[PDB]
Design a protein around this ligand. Structure first.
Ligand code: HEM
Ligand SMILES: CCCCCCCCCCCCCCCC[N+](C)(C)C
Length: 440
């Protein structure tokens, strides 16, 4: 039929990758502005169709796995995750493993997660000096990696094996290099150290499984106790892969959004006063942080929601088109890729009036702009929506509570200097991001 519009200029081998790399958010904004809800560009030799707006986002998220494949986008992560683990397995096994992941990340385990998250933040606060200058993102990355490793992997990783796991994690993360998009299977020393790190982490998982069989609430144990539709149990390879995938999934996303919550609150003393009022009221009615965060935090909840609207950490959601797909009268042929851009759809004026303004009261029950499910798309949507939704929200909300209760903060640079680095694989606050603290 009528194919989607194609961005007119490009390089032969690279397509639009240079313009994309300069500012990805700007590139996607510009494609929408010039071509519309369904617009095609090229990265290297591959053709991507950006789907923006509620309609096209519904098309994207609502499409079945037999139509839109999640596999190829994760090809770089396969040496870390493992051969037959999530996204490199066939659709059935992939989805069964992901469903195994789902329960451990919501509902009942959250209350046990809460105590340790609060305890970790308190512990870090105790050994700081009374006042100083820190990097906010550095702090949030350390806090979120510690708390999520403890909650999801187990106490063994935060305590006895902490040093070796820190090493293995930095080696694995250093193994996630973009060059692999261009030249896959290129031999690199960082890749050698990544592979060795994965071997060692699988050894550690095997050991801990054996010891736990001799003798806790965590994703590690939920995967030990989980089974397929067949009575077959998960191998140590599969368990180590799925665990490291969850750890990687939540680290930079949650850290960046916590950082942005703090930055925006310090930028806007109105909302900082509202949120601190909520914190001080909850600390009186419900002594201590506790699970009081989970529930009666509406103001901080909406602050986090608007933070995710204006700074969504995942800016491009890519899937290959397996069967001819049609959006808005336009045919997307198999072999093309489709993409969802939360940063672009969140800034559509029809969906969000005055899009560049930061007002968390967009999400009040009276206005309900997060109602579409295919407009506000920070956690994705559909079958493959975020399974770490509640855990991430709670981690952010709890970390902000303990920090804001125990310390008072001042922005160490210009309020307008704090910006997004869209050139990062998971978008985070900009490199300097410095703050000052003094204890209350
Ligand atoms: C505010 C922080 C977070 C954001 C913005 C976020 C966002 C997203 C998005 C947009 C997707 C869909 C990707 C796609 O469509 O293919 C996704 C998937 C996923 N997220 Fe998150 N996430 C966050 C935190 C977390 C955390 C903390 C965890 C684990 C503790 C987690 C676990 C997952 C998993 C397992 C999936 C896979 C869904 C599937 O493919 O079936 N996420 N996330
Ligand atoms: C269930 C699995 C969901 C997806 C998990 C993996 C998400 C992507 C992890 C990206 C890691 C970002 C940090 C690596 C950045 C690369 N550099 C180290 C070279 C900067």
């Amino acid at each position: 039929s009528n194919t989607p519009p194609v961005k007119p200029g490009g390089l032969p081998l690279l397509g639009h990758i240079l313009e994309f790399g300069k500012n990805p958010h700007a590139f996607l904004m510009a494609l929408r502005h010039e071509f519309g809800d369904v617009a095609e560009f090229r990265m290297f030799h591959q053709r991507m169709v950006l789907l923006t707006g509620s309609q096209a986002s519904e098309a994207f998220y609502r499409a079945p796995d037999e139509v839109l494949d999640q596999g190829p986008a994760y090809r770089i992560m396969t040496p870390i995750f493992g051969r037959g683990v999530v996204f490199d397995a066939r659709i059935e096994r992939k989805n069964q493993q992901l469903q195994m992941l789902m329960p451990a990340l919501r509902d009942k385990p959250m209350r046990t997660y809460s105590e340790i998250i609060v305890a970790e933040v308190e512990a870090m606060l105790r050994d700081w000096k009374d006042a100083g200058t820190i990097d906010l993102l550095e702090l949030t990355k350390e806090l979120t990696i510690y708390t999520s490793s403890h909650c999801l992997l187990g106490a063994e990783f935060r305590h006895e094996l902490n040093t070796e796991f820190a090493g293995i994690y930095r080696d694995l993360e250093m193994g996630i290099q973009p060059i692999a998009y261009v030249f896959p299977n290129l031999p690199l020393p960082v890749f050698k150290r990544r592979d060795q790190a994965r071997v060692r982490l699988q050894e550690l998982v095997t050991q801990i499984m054996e010891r736990r069989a001799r003798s806790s609430t965590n994703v590690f144990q939920m995967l030990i106790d989980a089974s397929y539709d067949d009575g077959s149990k998960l191998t140590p390879h599969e368990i180590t892969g799925m665990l490291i995938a969850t750890i990687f999934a939540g680290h930079h996303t949650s850290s960046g959004t916590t950082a942005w919550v703090l930055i925006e609150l310090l930028r806007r003393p109105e909302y900082l006063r509202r949120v601190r009022a909520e914190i001080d009221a909850l600390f009186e009615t419900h002594g201590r942080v506790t699970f009081e965060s989970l529930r009666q935090m509406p103001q901080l909840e909406n602050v986090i929601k608007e933070v995710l609207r204006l700074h969504p950490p995942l800016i491009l959601l890519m899937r290959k088109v397996m069967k001819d797909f049609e959006v808005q009268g336009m045919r997307i042929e198999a072999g093309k890729f489709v993409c969802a851009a939360p940063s672009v759809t969140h800034r559509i004026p029809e969906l969000f009036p005055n899009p560049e303004l930061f007002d968390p009261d967009r999400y009040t029950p009276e206005r309900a702009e997060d109602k579409d499910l295919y407009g506000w798309q920070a956690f994705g949507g559909g079958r493959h929506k975020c399974s770490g939704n509640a855990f991430a929200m709670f981690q952010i909300k709890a970390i902000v509570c303990v920090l804001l209760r125990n310390y008072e903060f001042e922005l160490a640079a210009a309020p307008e200097s704090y910006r997004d680095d869209y050139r990062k694989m998971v978008v985070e606050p900009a490199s300097p991001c410095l703050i000052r603290y003094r204890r209350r």
